[PDB]
Amino acid sequence: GLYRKYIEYPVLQKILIGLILGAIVGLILGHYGYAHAVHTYVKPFGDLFVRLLKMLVMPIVFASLVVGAASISPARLGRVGVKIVVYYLLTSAFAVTLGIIMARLFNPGAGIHLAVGGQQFQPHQAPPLVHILLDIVPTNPFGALANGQVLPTIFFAIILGIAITYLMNSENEKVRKSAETLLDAINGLAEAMYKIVNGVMQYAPIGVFALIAHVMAHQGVHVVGELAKVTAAVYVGLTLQILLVYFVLLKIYGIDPISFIKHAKDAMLTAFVTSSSSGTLPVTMRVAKEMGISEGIYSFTLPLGATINMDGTALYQGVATFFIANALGSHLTVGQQLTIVLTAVLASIGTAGVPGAGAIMLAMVLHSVGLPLTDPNVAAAYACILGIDAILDRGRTMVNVTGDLTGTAIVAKTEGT
Ligand SMILES: N[C@@H](CC(=O)O)C(=O)O
Ligand code: NA
Ligand code: NA
Ligand code: NA
């Protein structure tokens, strides 16, 4: 029936269509009253979409880090591996720092003041520094998962992944066999969650329509200018990452920047369209071959780099956090800003390569910096940046793929003779 044709039609196009019609309906219903009608009928559809994304946070956070830590563990890291791993972490750290600078320059979301319940967001008291540091170690690992504590879950997931790698290098056959079965079971869980993510994005066009209609009807056209600055900040941030960071690195190691861009045109263009790193990987592997990279070099960095390296996602997270904080009216302190850098890098490592995966991993940063999503004011602000995720997703994927190709160039140059 008609249900079929809705599926094969491109997902990215459907979300874009929902955004346009949702805005127009809100403005038409902006006048003539009927604002209460949108709040009581249209709104519950939007809340269903939000609850689906919140469900996927905890299982992905635990499973992705265990698999990720077991691939970059020092036990199984070779001479080529340690060089490429150091490259990934350093570039990601600089990327989120650049996003913080861009957010301050534009100050997105400052104009809007939202109080859904008639009470503005009240910042919570901050415990002493020693208490915060000691609470990273979970007393009960099972209790952290059940209570939705993010930071304690990060600590347990990483150490569990590293421990399994040492077991797989043991001498006892039974010990090694047990380790592989445990890792496969966790890996199977992680892959299953990404399939659910794809299913949710099919419902996104309906969910985006409800969220935009509610926002435009109440706040008004003032939102359009505010969201415009967010989109401008990210894309201007991304183009600086290509020019300021990648180009100078090529100059230092002697790689021609202009020639590099010409060869990598095919990989960059397809990544923009599909907005998925996994889909771009066969094309990305193909492009490196013409460049003269050794087969062994790009058969390891590119597979690992596709998921481990996501500089564009990290820059997106840094800017998104400031927009939510400014919208609520709160101000991020120096300590919280430093916390963003650490959390954003970890969130990028665990983020999936499927379109729209960045939104789910944004909950990690919000919890860490002291902005819980349970607060209705936060949930309102989280809804707007969620609606425009389709536009920002295209730009993020291009930078992620470009970094992987660039990183291999230096490693191949250095490893060779
Ligand atoms: N589309 C991104 C993931 C994301 O931004 O959620 C990638 O595949 O690298
Ligand atoms: Na990186
Ligand atoms: Na990547
Ligand atoms: Na990742």
Side-chain angles (χ1 to χ4, degrees), residues 307-308 310 348-352:
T307 59
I308 282 58
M310 296 182 178
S348 62
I349 301 179
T351 306

Side-chain angles (χ1 to χ4, degrees), residues 121-171:
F121 175 89
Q122 187 64 255
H124 187 273
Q125 185 61 256
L129 180 56
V130 291
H131 294 86
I132 305 180
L133 296 179
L134 295 178
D135 293 1
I136 307 180
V137 179
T139 60
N140 190 359
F142 300 104
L145 295 173
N147 300 359
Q149 302 175 2
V150 174
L151 294 177
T153 302
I154 312 297
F155 178 84
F156 183 81
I158 298 181
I159 65 178
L160 180 58
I162 303 179
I164 298 181
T165 63
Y166 287 96
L167 295 176
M168 293 177 70
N169 294 359
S170 179
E171 69 275 16

